[PDB]
Design a protein around this ligand. Structure first.
Ligand SMILES: Cc1cc2c(cc1C)N(C[C@H](O)[C@H](O)[C@H](O)COP(=O)(O)OP(=O)(O)OC[C@H]1O[C@@H](n3cnc4c(N)ncnc43)[C@H](O)[C@@H]1O)c1[nH]c(=O)[nH]c(=O)c1N2
Ligand SMILES: Nc1ncnc2c1ncn2[C@@H]1O[C@H](COP(=O)(O)OP(=O)(O)OP(=O)(O)O)[C@@H](O)[C@H]1O
Ligand SMILES: [Mg+2]
Lengths: 487, 55, 154, 623, 136, 55, 177, 160
RNA sequence: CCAUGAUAAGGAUUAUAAAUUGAAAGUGUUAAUAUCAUAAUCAAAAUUUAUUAUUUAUAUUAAAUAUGUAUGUGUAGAUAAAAUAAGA
């Protein structure tokens, strides 16, 4: 009767933001998230009211984040997420935030360090000496670690920090779409260079809508005034106008405009010396090495009359030409130009390395299409050493420790139950949090991707007898209690 | 570690197979992260031993 | 999807009777849970059938209790009631799985197998590149460019 | 529009070269002997017209044989007289077209006889083709039914008078232009006992089934070997290979030559919105009807071999008992006998041979006599329909003297809709209607139950039920169907015959266990046999135990019990044809499914609309 | 050996429920899961919540707890005949019964506006996308 | 189909996607003539010619 | 017939998990018992005779069950036939699909009697209204049941007449040999 | 280890496409290589049918060779190096030794006295240091010197 | 032309509770067939001759000559098989 009274008398707290709004009805998380009566002095009299024992982590802006928030969970509003991430998130970052679930992030030591670094970059001319000391003379940092770490999530956090401080930021959430893209096309104005039209058009559109506030104030310094323009369309005087011109076009004319817009945008950024620019590429190891595209067969570049007598084998035997290096891409060329060339103290590359390659451990049969978690994984099988393959300072990121793992798992389980994505009414079917924390830690090894996977895989646990034993014990207790009452 | 590879990789990160290996450390009321264990395969070697009987 | 050939249909009772081999296969159940979670909806029927399958598989080895001690008047009827209730819950989960698979196919522009219905854009069973020139169950002749269900771009 | 374009293509004053039968090369082959096929006969084994044409060609010399079949376009897409039902529903139309294709294959590949298929008016197409081909003798069977007897008379008159037809207006012309005095031979081959052999005249025939059975006891049946010999010798006659289809045409790579003809389809005939004509129910029966003549012969042989003779009478009984409508041992030969693919003489010869072979058994003679009795009953219904003439299709039956107790035929569109959709409360009637709507065939007891329930049980007009059975049943014989409907609607009340039994009596008699109802409506499987045939009697507890919730599934009966207006409300009495019903949500535009005024709602080609039809459509729109 | 044009029991019904009854088997892969994740990310970034609302409505309609069957309510079983093994008859009976038992005619599932579902939000306005509309 | 696939592999502008992501028509469906528009075309080819499905 | 899992050990059929929780449960039980003792101590410190007399409005119903048949008939007090006899053969149940053994069974008698009563009620109302005797809005007709035969259909017939007790009220239940 | 399949499924009665069952030669298996073994359509064994597509041994060898090709390509994709013959005088001390042939000795180790125990046959040397030996005549500035990060430097990662 | 042996089909029942990881498949007969120990006029190279458990729709003939005809909504009747590392 007491629990029924608590559920009936529970009153939902006032909604303050998206994080407070996402909350399932009381009957969903009644058992998963218990309730207790607390005395609150609403009018100086401690009226006893029913309140939850758990709440979603606070939604704290990057400025509000401080040293005391390290190894703790915070949330970002849905509108703030939309405004600051038009391109998207990392390859596997968004898996933990469905529409009902709150968007939450863990504030780690590296996250705090990069947040301070972005704060110093905000006014880079005054803090130039300390920034150079932090990067040891390199043009930014590169995050490296094993598969499953918080690498992509850290890059998303850095983008959030840069966007919240009104800094021009290039974001490539998935570098696979450039190197291992759908198709490749030679550059129209750059001889000997290629590009991926699909990724480039998306990059132009999303960069425009992200920094529209700043790119409109940006003025064109190295850009011709005779750009090809259709009737009724205004000439671009701002960088945002240039980006809109490049991406908003009817096919196939958008291909050539995009190939031109990327070249001119790179020139405009390269000719900037007073504004801090942050460039975040998730998976820079793909740009370091060659792309999966191969050079066209030369017989496609001369024309044939008949296949019989033409000294050609294009139609008879497929052959592998040397793969096109990423350094010949237009986007990559501009990045490499800004890196290798000096006198660029305002551009900082906060990049990362992806290790999402397909597994290969000596023998490789044919993976089952029905069950294969690596359907979209890269077919690289290539070792990568950031020290020898990047000009940036390498930062090594390992798996979660005990504190971060506990905070991450507590957020996942309890926020999911509160949002209506957990056991809910079947809370008693699974063990308590301590058993979950212990068991999942063994299953995953405190690898953040493993933690998420085993959090989902908890549904099929078979050998967890904690709840079954408790049910028998409590039933035995109540049977004895009833017998004592009768006697 | 099983045959020089982590248990998660040997069982292909399957919770319903790794929980069987975890069970003795729960029934004995011990801690899994207090002992180093290695498994040596001496029967018929197969590319994948991710199954209930092998577990 | 990648499977586009002709398919036969089986009663839901058969798939439910199939225990921890196809219906209760933990990997398949985890995939269904991921499908529900990425759509941001609760997995209550999936968890119900999961706990039912766990309880059934844990004690499938044990011999049944003596039926002579059990009262055929009441105990057998109670057991039948519980079995039917579990079977109905599993039926609901099976139906939900099929419905959400069709919905996700329609959203993701995934062409299903032959004679498979996707509500909203097929409504009569999409068939393409089949052994029979005519559409099964409809007798409608089929073109060679079978059917463009979705828009071209992307 | 398809009929108009067919008329403008073929029935044109000039008859363009594309729609012209090629002339023969040899001067002898210029003339030929033509045969007309129809829905009454699509066989090549016992066709009297075919045998007579073969004999005529043999007597004349090397005269070729030509076959023509013109489909009656009106019968496939025109609405019914009462209630606007379809005529030749798509289920029947597909079977008809498949049988026509089988006949064409039989004639062109086995007998090497080119068959020319035409679409439109038979009375227009046939004489014009006679004139163009220069046929000397046109052999055809005698149709004696309305819309068939009149067209046959017009055809023979136009053949005698050598009349050309142009169809911009209804205009006829002499044979002076054709840009030999032909004779038409009309032969009687429909009845098992050929006319002019009856022991008593039709005019002075006493109206009685048992009297006709006693007459057929003395009457003889013509053999089939005499006509088979002529059919076999037909092959020796020279044939015009230019009219035969080619390998590409057989493979379907190119359409048939325009002078030959193109088999029409459902859309070409006029069937619109096929999605509304797809019945999504469980087909409990496990036997089908493969259209054709060889298939019909194989079905006859298999039914004889597998012990199907017990379907007539159970072994060692000598008295008719309740039938097993759920069985697969029944001879489903009524479609093949009504469409003419299987000849009654051939079926009788098969029965006689089987009985003679198994005569060592002491009961096969009784079963043979029962089968002959059923065939003679079909012939008797034919004779009674001929006697009644046009009066058979009028209100209150042909004989108003027997209709003293009949009411004034109250007609309700929604009641007719529920009856034709099977949404009644009687499990036997529902199962019979489901079987008829799905398979296109149901047993004699099911037909009796349905017709009696619609006519006398509910008070609705009997013509509505007769036309619905015409629309559904693939074995629709006009005379047999309408005569049985009149007899079992208590319109024709001839004594010394089968009694008209209640639907409840039929359910208790032929389906006492309820296998048939529990098989065709498997949602009622849990109801005990004591409570089947009356599931509305169950209380709430009993219906929850047996898993049959009235109103949700298997609604309440059309005929509520005494009271039932104070203890029931709209929550229990669920509607099935309101504005927000599934029936409206069909046809991909929204008009309805299958039922009242379905031809008006779905059909594309409608000719001569009626005031009653328009008023019914307006009432349906308002409601 | 014999060729039959009989419509087998494997005929699908494309007018009873969003999913055809006796549905064809479906193979849901991790490639499909990844594509769904990408699509959901793009949709939520664009701000179109109509598809999510429709999905939530479908889940609310078809994801309710079945009711407790009264004693005596059980699926029909096939009788034990002495005519050997009527495997085909058993299969036909089972398929026919399950085809008749369409999801629309599932009486144990509480479906419709009349029933109350105290576990899910009734309308899209209650969902957190309308957090600005529920303030102070 | 064979030379088309080989040309797509040789050009390399699409990459290794031809056999991993690209989908192709079946054998007897992709051996149809240029303009068919009907799935009932492979059954309408010449049968007297013994050519193992090559018209 | 043989055991399917004979090769599995008894300790494995089934295996008891959660052995580590038993000690904790025992200690918790000891603590709970101790605090229960503590609170208990705290509370302690703190023509004539038995022959029926008929009425002119009561209808005599006769139910005659046979070895392979059953009959239900009714008569008014004057001695007129309200409705003709309803038999199993008349209803069609005797025809077949169940065998001669099922003839005159409990369910058969029940359904025959139910059909006869349902057809009797409007006929009875018409008969009453013929002589200007309305039945009234609430139909409660008194009938005397007379059962004969000693067969299986007798139980079905008496169950059927017990049914619809709102319309039919049994006044005397007599048996005739 | 590996997770995919290496053995062809066995020959049984015809597998119908349903739940937990796939046709034996469906296009999904082995990527798409069941096309070689697929005998399309219903086959009358009396006359129609190739023997090798039904022989369980030949199809097994075909599956084995396909898996071997897959293993070879996946192994060769790991190669980010080439083998160059050096005149034995310019190699470092860790290479100036008697290196045994493959499969003729226990796996050797590079200078175990230098706390290095890695396999000697899997050592890969970058060109940033070998340009002097590889291209003596070229000289000039080819492959500019590889910058090596200073470990003992107070950068951001050192919590400066 | 040796009539005599095997085989096919094929079943039986004690193991309480604790411990232990343990302590757990057995065939008559009736049948058909056949190449053996038993009774002389004729099968094994020139094979058409009809002898149960087969590959069904992204890619399909290279090493001893190695299968061109049955797509039809997978739709009958009969027949066989198992409680065996599986999950009635
Ligand atoms: C309301 C209504 C409507 C119709 C009919 C009856 C009733 C009551 N009938 C007659 C009867 O329904 C039908 O002939 C048989 O039920 C067909 O089933 P079987 O082929 O299994 O009969 P069965 O196996 O006995 O076949 C023997 C043949 O005898 C003939 N026959 C059998 N019973 C007959 C009967 N009662 N009357 C006439 N001929 C009979 C048929 O030619 C039948 O093919 C009919 N029949 C028909 O051929 N076409 C129709 O359109 C109709 N319509
Ligand atoms: N700080 C964090 N806060 C919240 N979630 C995190 C954090 N770090 C990691 N995750 C979670 O880890 C999962 C995957 O991490 P992430 O995308 O960073 O992997 P990765 O190391 O880049 O992998 P890969 O090698 O595949 O590129 C996601 O579910 C993401 O939410
Ligand atoms: Mg990543």
């Amino acid at each position: 009767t007491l629990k029924k009274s608590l559920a009936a008398m529970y009153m939902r707290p006032p909604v303050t933001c998206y994080t407070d709004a996402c909350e399932a009805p009381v009957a969903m998380w009644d058992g998963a998230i218990p309730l207790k009566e607390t005395r609150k002095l609403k009018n100086g009299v401690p009226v006893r009211t029913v309140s939850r024992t758990y709440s979603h982590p606070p939604q704290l802006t990057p400025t509000q984040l401080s040293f005391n928030d390290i190894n703790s969970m915070y949330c970002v509003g849905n509108d703030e997420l939309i405004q600051f991430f038009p391109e998207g998130l990392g390859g596997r970052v968004f898996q933990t935030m469905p529409p009902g679930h709150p968007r939450g992030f863990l504030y780690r030591k590296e996250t705090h360090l990069l947040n301070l670094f972005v704060d110093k970059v905000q006014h880079w001319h005054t803090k130039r000496s300390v920034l150079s000391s932090l990067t040891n003379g390199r043009t930014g940092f590169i995050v490296d670690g094993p598969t499953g770490c918080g690498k992509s999530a850290l890059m998303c956090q850095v983008v959030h920090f840069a966007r919240s401080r009104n800094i021009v930021t290039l974001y490539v959430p998935d570098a696979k779409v450039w190197t291992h893209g759908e198709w490749c096309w030679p550059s129209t104005i750059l001889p000997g260079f290629f590009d991926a039209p699909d990724a480039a058009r998306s990059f132009l559109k999303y960069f425009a809508v992200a920094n529209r506030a700043t790119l409109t104030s940006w003025k064109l310094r190295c850009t011709p005034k005779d750009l090809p323009t259709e009737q009724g369309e205004r000439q671009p005087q701002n960088l945002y106008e240039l980006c809109e011109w490049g991406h908003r076009a009817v096919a196939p004319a958008s291909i050539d405009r995009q190939s031109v817009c990327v070249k001119f945008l790179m020139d405009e950024l390269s000719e900037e010396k007073k504004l801090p620019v942050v460039i975040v590429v998730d998976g820079w190891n793909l740009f370091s090495h060659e792309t999966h595209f191969r050079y066209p067969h030369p017989d496609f570049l001369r024309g044939l009359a008949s296949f019989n007598e033409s000294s050609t084998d294009i139609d008879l035997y497929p052959q592998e030409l040397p793969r096109i290096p990423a350094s010949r891409l237009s986007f990559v060329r501009g990045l490499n130009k800004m890196i290798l060339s000096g006198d660029d103290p305002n551009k900082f590359f906060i990049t990362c390395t992806t290790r999402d390659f397909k597994p290969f451990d000596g023998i490789s049969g044919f993976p089952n299409v029905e069950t294969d978690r690596f359907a979209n994984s890269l077919d690289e099988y290539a070792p990568y050493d950031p020290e020898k393959d990047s000009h940036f300072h390498p930062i090594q990121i390992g798996n979660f420790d005990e504190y971060e793992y506990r905070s991450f798992l507590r957020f996942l389980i309890n926020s999911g139950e509160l949002a209506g994505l957990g056991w809910g009414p079947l809370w008693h079917a699974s063990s308590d949090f301590e058993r979950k924390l212990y068991k999942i830690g063994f299953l995953s090894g405190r690898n953040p991707q493993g933690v998420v996977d085993h959090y989902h895989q908890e549904l099929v646990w078979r050998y967890d007898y904690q709840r079954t034993r408790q049910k028998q014990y409590l039933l035995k207790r109540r049977m004895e209690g009833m017998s004592r009452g009768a006697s | 570690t099983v045959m020089g590879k982590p248990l998660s990789l040997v069982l292909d990160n399957k919770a319903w197979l790794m929980e069987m290996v975890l069970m003795p450390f729960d029934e004995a009321n011990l801690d899994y992260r207090d002992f180093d264990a290695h498994i040596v395969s001496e029967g018929h070697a197969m590319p994948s031993i991710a199954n209930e009987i092998a577990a | 999807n990648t499977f586009l050939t002709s398919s036969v249909a089986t009663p839901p009772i058969s798939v439910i009777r199939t225990g921890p081999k196809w219906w209760a296969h933990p990997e398949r159940m985890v995939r269904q849970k991921l499908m529900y979670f990425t759509l941001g909806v609760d997995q209550l029927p999936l968890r119900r059938t999961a706990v039912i399958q766990r309880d059934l598989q844990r004690f499938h080895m044990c011999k049944p209790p003596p039926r002579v001690g059990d009262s055929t008047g009441y105990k057998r009827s109670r057991a039948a009631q519980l079995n039917t209730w579990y079977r109905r819950i599993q039926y609901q989960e099976y139906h939900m799985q099929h419905l959400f698979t069709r919905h996700v196919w329609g959203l993701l522009r995934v062409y299903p197998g032959n004679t498979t219905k996707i509500q909203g854009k097929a409504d009569d069973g999409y068939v393409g590149y089949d052994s029979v020139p005519f559409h099964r169950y409809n007798r409608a002749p089929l073109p060679f460019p079978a059917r463009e269900l979705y828009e071209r771009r992307k | 529009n398809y009929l108009s374009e067919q008329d403008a293509l073929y029935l044109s004053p000039t008859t363009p070269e594309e729609a012209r039968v090629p002339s023969a090369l040899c001067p002898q082959l210029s003339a030929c002997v033509m045969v007309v096929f129809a829905a009454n006969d699509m066989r090549v084994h016992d066709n009297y017209a075919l045998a007579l044409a073969a004999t005529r060609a043999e007597a004349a010399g090397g005269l070729p044989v030509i076959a023509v079949t013109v489909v009656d376009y009106r019968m496939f897409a025109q609405p019914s007289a009462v209630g606007g039902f379809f005529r030749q529903s798509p289920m029947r139309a597909r079977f008809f077209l498949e049988t026509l294709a089988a006949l064409r294959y039989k004639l062109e590949r086995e007998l090497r006889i080119p068959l020319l298929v035409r679409c439109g008016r038979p009375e227009d197409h046939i004489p014009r083709l006679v004139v163009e081909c220069g046929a000397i003798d046109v052999f055809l069977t005698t149709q004696y039914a309305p819309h068939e007897k009149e067209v046959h008379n017009d055809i023979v008159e136009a053949i005698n008078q050598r009349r050309w037809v142009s169809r911009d207006p209804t205009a006829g012309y002499k044979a002076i232009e054709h840009d030999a005095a032909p004779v038409a031979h009309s032969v009687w081959q429909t009845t098992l006992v050929h006319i002019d052999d009856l022991p008593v005249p039709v005019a002075s025939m006493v109206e009685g089934e048992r009297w006709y059975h006693d007459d057929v006891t003395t009457a003889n049946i013509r053999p089939t070997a005499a006509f088979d010999r002529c059919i076999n010798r037909l092959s020796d006659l020279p044939a015009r290979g230019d009219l035969l289809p080619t390998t590409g045409e057989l493979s379907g790579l190119e359409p048939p030559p325009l002078y030959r003809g193109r088999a029409p389809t459902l859309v070409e005939l006029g069937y619109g919105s096929p999605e509304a004509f797809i019945e999504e129910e469980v087909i409990a029966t496990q036997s089908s009807h493969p259209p054709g003549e060889d298939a019909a012969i194989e079905r006859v042989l298999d039914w004889l071999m597998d012990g199907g003779m017990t379907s007539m009478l159970r072994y060692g009984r000598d008295r008719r008992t309740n039938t097993k409508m759920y069985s697969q041992r029944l001879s489903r030969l009524s479609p093949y006998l009504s469409c003419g693919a299987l000849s009654p003489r051939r079926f009788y010869e098969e029965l006689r041979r089987f009985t003679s072979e198994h005569l060592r058994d002491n009961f096969v003679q009784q079963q043979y006599r029962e089968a002959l009795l059923r065939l003679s009953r079909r012939d008797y219904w034919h004779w009674m329909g001929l006697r009644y003439g046009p009066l058979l299709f009028y209100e209150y039956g042909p004989r108003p003297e027997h209709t003293d107790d009949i009411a004034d035929w109250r007609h309700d569109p929604k009641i007719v809709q529920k009856w034709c959709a099977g949404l009644t409360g009687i499990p036997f009637a529902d199962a019979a209607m489901r079987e008829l709507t799905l398979t296109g065939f149901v047993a004699d007891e099911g037909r009796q139950g349905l017709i009696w329930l619609l006519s006398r049980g509910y008070g609705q007009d009997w013509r509505l039920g007769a036309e619905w059975l015409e629309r559904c049943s693939i074995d629709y014989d006009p005379f047999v169907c309408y005569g049985n409907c009149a007899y079992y609607s208590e319109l024709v009340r001839d004594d010394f015959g089968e009694t008209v039994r209640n639907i409840h009596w039929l359910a208790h008699h032929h389906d006492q266990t309820g296998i048939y109802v529990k098989k065709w409506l498997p949602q009622l499987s849990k109801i005990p046999p004591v409570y089947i045939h009356r599931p509305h009697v169950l209380t709430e507890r009993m219906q929850a135990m047996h898993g049959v919730q009235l109103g949700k599934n298997y609604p309440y009966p059309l005929k509520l019990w005494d009271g039932a207006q104070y203890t029931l409300s709209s929550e229990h009495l669920t509607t099935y044809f309101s504005e927000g019903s599934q029936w409206h949500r069909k046809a991909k535009n929204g008009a309805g499914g299958s039922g009242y005024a379905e031809a008006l709602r779905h059909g594309t080609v409608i000719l001569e609309p009626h005031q009653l039809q328009s008023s019914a459509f307006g009432e349906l729109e308002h409601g | 050996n014999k060729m039959r044009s009989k419509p087998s029991d494997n005929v699908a019904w494309y007018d009873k429920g969003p999913v055809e009854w006796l549905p064809r088997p479906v193979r849901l892969t991790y490639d499909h899961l990844d594509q769904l994740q990408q699509w959901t990310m793009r949709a939520t970034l664009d701000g179109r919540t109509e598809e999510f609302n429709r999905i939530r409505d479908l889940h609310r309609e078809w994801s309710q707890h079945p009711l407790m069957p009264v004693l005596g309510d059980v699926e029909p079983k096939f009788p034990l005949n002495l005519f050997k093994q009527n495997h085909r008859a058993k299969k036909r009976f089972l398929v026919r019964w399950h085809k008749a038992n369409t999801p629309a005619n599932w009486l144990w599932m509480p479906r419709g506006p009349t029933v109350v579902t105290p576990l899910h939000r009734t309308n899209p306005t209650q969902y957190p996308e309308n957090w600005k509309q529920m303030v102070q | 189909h064979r030379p088309v696939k080989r040309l797509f592999c040789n050009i390399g502008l699409m990459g290794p996607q031809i056999t991993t992501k690209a989908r192709w028509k079946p054998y007897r469906f992709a051996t149809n003539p240029a303009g068919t528009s009907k799935a009932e075309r492979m059954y309408q080819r010449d049968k007297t010619v013994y050519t193992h499905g090559h018209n | 017939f043989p055991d399917k899992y004979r090769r599995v050990p008894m300790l494995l059929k089934p295996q008891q998990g959660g052995q580590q929780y038993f000690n904790h449960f025992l200690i918790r039980s000891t603590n709970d018992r101790l605090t229960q003792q503590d609170v208990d101590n705290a509370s302690g410190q703190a023509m004539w005779g038995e022959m029926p007399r008929y009425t002119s409005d009561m209808v005599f119903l006769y139910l005659v069950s046979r070895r392979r048949n059953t009959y239900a008939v009714a008569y008014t007090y004057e001695g007129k036939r309200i409705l003709n006899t309803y038999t199993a053969g008349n209803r069609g149940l005797k025809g077949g699909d169940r065998g001669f053994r099922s003839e005159g069974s409990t369910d058969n008698g029940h359904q025959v009697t139910s059909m006869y009563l349902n057809d009797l009620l409007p006929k009875l109302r018409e008969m009453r209204a013929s002589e200007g005797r309305p039945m009234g809005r609430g139909e409660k007709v008194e009938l005397v049941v007379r059962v004969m035969g000693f067969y299986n259909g007798r139980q079905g017939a008496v169950r059927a007449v017990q049914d619809r007790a709102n319309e039919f009220h049994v006044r005397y239940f007599e048996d005739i040999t | 280890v590996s997770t995919g399949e290496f053995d062809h499924p066995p020959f049984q009665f015809r597998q119908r496409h349903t739940f937990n069952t796939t046709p034996l030669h469906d296009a999904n298996r082995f990527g798409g290589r069941t096309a070689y073994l697929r005998e399309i359509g219903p086959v009358n064994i009396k006359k129609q049918g190739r023997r090798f597509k039904k022989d369980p041994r030949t199809v097994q060898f075909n599956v084995d060779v396909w898996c071997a090709q897959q293993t070879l390509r996946k192994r060769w994709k790991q190669r980010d190096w080439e083998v160059i013959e050096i005149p034995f005088r310019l190699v470092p001390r860790e290479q100036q030794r008697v290196i045994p042939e493959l499969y003729t000795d226990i796996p050797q180790m590079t200078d175990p006295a230098r706390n290095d125990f890695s396999n000697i046959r899997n050592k890969v040397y970058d060109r940033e240091e070998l340009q002097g030996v590889l291209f003596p005549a070229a000289g000039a500035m080819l492959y500019p010197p590889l910058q090596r990060v200073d470990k003992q430097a107070m950068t951001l990662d050192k919590y400066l």
